[PDB]
Every structure is written in structure tokens, then in C-alpha cells.
Design a protein around this ligand. Structure first.
Ligand SMILES: [Mg+2]
Ligand SMILES: [Mg+2]
Ligand SMILES: [Mg+2]
Ligand SMILES: [Mg+2]
Lengths: 214, 218
RNA sequence: GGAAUUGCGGGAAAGGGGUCAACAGCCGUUCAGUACCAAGUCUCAGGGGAAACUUUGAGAUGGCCUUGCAAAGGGUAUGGUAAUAAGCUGACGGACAUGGUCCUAACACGCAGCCAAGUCCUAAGUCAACAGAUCUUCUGUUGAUAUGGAUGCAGUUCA
């Protein structure tokens, strides 16, 4: 089969920067190469076909070129809405094959997370489980550490986190971390705290609450 | 608007069968080839089968050949992918995509929205929805706990509230069940006047849950 | 002395000029429709030729993806159309800011025309070698040979 090797697997670039993504075909594919943009959870969107033809609905800042078996997608002035995974595809011989994808993220000024903590609902707690959620809202860059402490006891193994994909207007992320405790364990302890470390924060920020109707 | 409308995926047990449909709207199926591309959760695009615009030349990936069968209904402007003897390797979002007839070197111009096929013995379970109560901007949300399979989608105030909303990727828990949170930031002055309801759709369990989220007390 | 030194297409740098914040322009893997089915290659038939070839008619193939090529691969009338098959018309969709578009246009490329050389085909005519005699004249085979052709990427300038 024909392998399509996509370089940068990931890149971060500022609004206005020229972004270059290359695809090396393992053998000649003439110009039978297409480029797609895929936004998270969405179908891939055709950008370029036959190596250099621009498809309709695509800003003219996207262009494609070929040199031998090397194909280049160029975004000439990156915009915030261009965050996506980009895929090259060859339609020269069966099977049709895609590159492994290049994730593009938009670099912007560092922004610290606004941190919120939410205690378990009383209805969930009566059912035997406590989910404590820590929200880190609108931060950049994506890298952030959340540590949970119950009565200052460092927690491990009982939390999971989820991160949104980059905002198409302000290029920030949001992250939720959920601490899961049994009703028994949750009612034994008083202070629930999530400690956030991020480049936008000169020191780790703690947000906490004390268990109880108060 | 010209489009490809996909349906028919969802949960199936190993060895089970699913039939995906791809209805063309605004372009002619007879002058298209139809391609099936799948993407395992968090992974890349894989081309698995296609039927050329002559409708007779089909290709199938070796691992799919014999189990999968493309057909087309000219009268309904619809293509199908029958997927038999399904196994965990087949779990993925399946896209149908088309290409103009004869344009053999081109990519795919119209794509279906994608359908998740999950091959699992695990049982469907609808979500419990709990408030993340708010306690000059306030964050509030809902926690959608313990559902299977994906997907869940969340809106706020029936799609009327979209600004400031963050719905997080589902997290697979040790239990085998998914959880996700959806949060929205609103003006604190609106908390006593504006009603905030999260609308959670879990079509795999035939369930929609609306949860009004309000201040509690502590 | 005379002939010929050609007709075009899609692009397009620079400077200038018109126009467009979404264009009666431009782009389309969308939909419908109008007109049309080229060149090249091959086969046969009618006309020319010694032949090779040529011209006309019919058919096949070709054409599209593919404007570096297009063998392979796919498509191939449910198809196709640049310069010798509208790359047409309407609608729909789309792109555009020191950007889109149009005029002016260096320039290279491409489609054709004419084609020097070269190559290749043919060998009527002629020549040669051998052979044959019909007595001063001859015919036979084998070969070469264009001045016959086809091909032809050179050249197609200056103003
Ligand atoms: Mg033509
Ligand atoms: Mg063409
Ligand atoms: Mg024409
Ligand atoms: Mg010439």
C-alpha cells in the first residue's frame, strides 16, 4: 500500500504565523493528494484536492503544493478558528490511505484558569457516591496540574479530568477534574480542596469548601 | 443545502450486525462514489470500503471483506453499509463520504456527520444528572453520571444559552460507565431571575433529561 | 524578383488603470438545461498512386480524473468538451483586503499550421553483383538507391 507520512504530528503557532504541514508519500502518487481539516467530534472537511486545488468554503489562506512525493499544506496567516487535526489523503492507488494527522493549536498569551469547586449534590450523596468537581475555566496553555486534598491529605487514584478543545475565538481551554469518593469516606472528612498549578499562576491556587449545610 | 445524512450505528454485541445508512440530499448518488471511513475513538482516519459510481466496483479492506457489504438504493438516493460479525476492532465513528463520479484522483467533498459504532457486551444505561450548583460571574453546570454507551449531548435552556458553555469530553470510569460535565458561566445577578436548565440527550438509552440548576445553600 | 515566415489556448512577473466588502467578474467534486462528440491511432469501402502513402465515407479506439506525463489505476454516453467535442447558459454554493476581479503584458508553457535537417517506409525508374543468351540489341534473380512518401521535438525573426 502507499504510506502517507505527515510531519509535524503536532504544532503550536500564533495568529498571523505561516503554518506548514508536509506529507511524504512512500511512492509516487502523482498529484492525487487531498487535505482535510477535522474539528473535534466533526466530520473531516475537504480543503485542497489534486495537491493544489482549493475546495469551496475554504479561506484562500489555505494552499497546497507538491514537490515530487512531498506535499505541503500551508496556512499563510493562521487564525484562531484554524485549530484542528489536518489529514492528507492519497487517491492514487487502492487502498486510499490518510496521513496520521497533524494537530494544530493556536498559541496565545498565557491566561490563568479561573477556578471553581462544586460539592456533590445531596441526591447523589444519598445514593452512596460523592463526585466533587473542580472547574478550571478559560486558561492557556493547556498544561495544568490539579491536586485534590481532603483534610490536607493528598489524594491519588480517585480523580479523573477532562479538557475542552481550544476555543475558536479566544484560544483558551477549560478543564474539569472530578474526585470520586464513597458516601462513607466523604462524610468522614471536612475540607475538600483542589489545588491548581498553571503557568499563569505565580503560586498554586487552592479552591475549597467545608462539607455541611452550614 | 447539499448534504449526506448518516444513520444506523450504535451499540452491538460482539458477533452482532449493524446496517449504516447514508442518504444523499441535493446531489445524485448515481454520479457519486461512496466511501466509508472510520475513526476509532481518539485515533486517525481509516478508509474501509467504497463503491464506485458504476455501482459494481466495490473495494473492502481485508479485515472487513466478507463481513461488510456496501449496497445502494437508487430510488431512495441512499447507500448502505451492512456490517456483520462485528468485533471490538470495529468500534469507531463511521463516516460515509462521497466523491464526484470519474474524479478518481480527488478527495471526498461531502461527508456524513459520523455515527458511533460501539461493539461491546456491556448493557445500555441512561444517565443520572446532578446539578453543579452555583455558590460578578457564577459557574453552574450539570454532572451526567454513569451512562453507556456514548454519546451524550448537552444543551442549556434548549439551545438558547450557548455563550460561556463548556461541555467536557466524556470520561470512561473504572465502572465501565461514562461521565461528563457541562458547565456554563452566567452573570451572578441573573441567578435569582434567570432559570438555567441543562438538557441532556442520551439517544442510546432513549432518554432526555432536563435538570434545572439553582443555588442550594452551601 | 516571387512564395512562405502562421492561427490560437490556458496562465502570467512588473508598473499603470477600471471595478468589488461581496461583484452582470472570478472559483466549484452542486443541480437543471442548450450546443456539440474534436485531434491522434486502427480497420474497411469509394477516388489517386508502382508501392509506400494519400483523400473522402463508415466504423472502432480515443477523450475524463490528467494544464509535467497518463502506461498502471479508476471512469468511460448514468460519459465527455482549453487551443479543431459550448469547457456554454441559468440557478445554487463559494473566495477575496496592501486581497479578488478585469484591461494593458514581459515571459515561459501548451494546442494547431508551415515545416529545414534527421529518421523511417516504399523502389516505379535507375544502378551494381552474379546468371542467362537472341550474332553487336537482351532477360532473370539478389541487393542498393528517392528524385516518391510518411514522420519531423529545428526554425517560425525584426518592426
Ligand atoms: Mg479541444
Ligand atoms: Mg481538460
Ligand atoms: Mg472547442
Ligand atoms: Mg514547431
Amino acid at each position: 500500500d502507499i504510506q502517507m507520512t505527515q510531519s509535524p504530528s503536532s504544532l503550536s503557532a500564533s495568529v498571523g504565523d505561516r503554518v506548514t504541514i508536509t506529507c511524504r508519500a512512500s511512492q509516487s502518487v502523482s498529484s492525487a493528494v487531498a487535505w482535510y481539516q477535522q474539528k473535534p467530534g466533526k466530520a473531516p472537511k475537504l480543503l485542497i484536492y489534486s495537491a493544489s486545488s482549493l475546495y469551496s468554503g475554504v479561506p484562500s489562506r489555505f494552499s497546497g503544493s507538491r514537490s515530487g512525493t512531498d506535499f505541503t499544506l500551508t496556512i499563510s496567516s493562521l487564525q484562531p478558528e484554524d485549530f484542528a487535526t489536518y489529514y492528507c489523503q492519497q487517491s492514487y492507488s487502492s487502498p486510499i490511505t490518510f496521513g496520521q494527522g497533524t494537530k494544530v493549536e493556536i498559541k496565545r498569551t498565557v491566561a490563568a484558569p479561573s477556578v471553581f469547586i462544586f460539592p456533590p449534590s445531596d441526591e447523589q450523596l444519598k445514593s452512596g457516591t460523592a463526585s466533587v468537581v473542580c472547574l478550571l475555566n478559560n486558561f492557556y496553555p493547556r498544561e495544568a496540574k490539579v491536586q485534590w486534598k481532603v483534610d490536607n491529605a493528598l489524594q491519588s487514584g480517585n480523580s479523573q479530568e477532562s479538557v475542552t478543545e481550544q476555543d475558536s475565538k479566544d484560544s483558551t481551554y477549560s478543564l474539569s477534574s472530578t474526585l470520586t469518593l464513597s458516601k462513607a469516606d466523604y462524610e468522614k472528612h471536612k475540607v475538600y480542596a483542589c489545588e491548581v498549578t498553571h503557568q499563569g499562576l505565580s503560586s498554586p491556587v487552592t479552591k475549597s469548601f467545608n462539607r455541611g449545610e452550614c | 443545502e447539499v448534504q449526506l445524512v448518516e444513520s444506523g450505528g450504535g451499540l452491538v454485541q460482539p458477533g452482532g450486525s449493524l446496517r449504516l445508512s447514508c442518504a444523499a440530499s441535493g446531489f445524485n448518488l448515481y454520479s457519486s462514489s461512496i466511501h466509508w471511513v472510520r475513526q476509532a475513538p481518539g485515533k486517525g482516519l481509516e478508509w474501509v470500503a467504497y463503491i464506485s459510481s458504476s455501482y459494481g466496483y466495490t473495494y473492502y479492506a481485508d479485515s472487513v471483506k466478507g463481513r461488510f457489504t456496501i449496497s445502494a438504493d437508487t430510488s431512495k438516493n441512499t447507500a448502505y453499509l451492512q456490517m456483520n460479525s462485528l468485533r471490538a476492532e470495529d468500534t469507531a465513528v463511521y463516516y460515509c463520504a462521497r466523491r464526484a463520479a470519474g474524479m478518481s484522483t480527488y478527495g471526498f467533498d461531502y461527508w456524513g456527520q459520523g455515527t458511533l459504532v460501539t461493539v461491546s457486551s456491556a448493557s445500555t444505561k441512561g444517565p443520572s444528572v446532578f446539578p453543579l450548583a452555583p455558590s460578578g460571574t457564577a459557574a453552574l453546570g450539570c454532572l451526567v453520571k454513569d451512562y453507556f454507551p456514548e454519546p451524550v449531548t448537552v444543551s442549556w435552556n434548549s439551545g438558547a444559552l450557548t455563550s460561556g458553555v463548556h461541555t467536557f469530553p466524556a470520561v470512561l470510569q473504572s465502572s465501565g460507565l461514562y461521565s461528563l460535565s457541562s458547565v456554563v458561566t452566567v452573570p451572578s445577578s441573573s441567578l435569582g431571575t434567570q432559570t438555567y436548565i441543562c438538557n441532556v440527550n442520551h439517544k442510546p438509552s432513549n432518554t432526555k433529561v432536563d435538570k434545572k440548576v439553582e443555588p442550594k445553600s452551601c
